[PDB]
Amino acid sequence: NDSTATFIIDGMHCKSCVSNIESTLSALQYVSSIVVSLENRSAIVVYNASSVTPESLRKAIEAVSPGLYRVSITSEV
Template identity: 40%
Template sequence: MERVELAVKGMHCENCVASVTQALKAINGVKLARVSLENEQADVTYDPSKTSLQALKDAVEAAGYQVAS
């Protein structure tokens, strides 16, 4: 398992948090996704043999938010 913190921009409310959380949890290999509106951050634990960091970023962006590098 690997853990990564993604800086997520564009969230404004708890519905945004739910959207990002749902997008991340829908990825095969994601074991845990905690999203903080206050910190503008997603803390994700995932299996690198099943998914990639890029897939996590792509999912957040597909949900309509930006991942800061």
């Protein structure tokens, strides 16, 4: 059973950006589903996390618009 995280990407006005980001999220060597939301500001992913930093996947956002996208994470570490 997997760790489902949400990253809330307040990036641009469209937030279309999320799926551009999902392409990175859904390519990592530890993930079983990609589940983003663009009209909103959401990127959701099924993957391996807890005793390893979930903030890993945040770098997908940070690499397309560093210092810009207000991405907020559901985590506990």
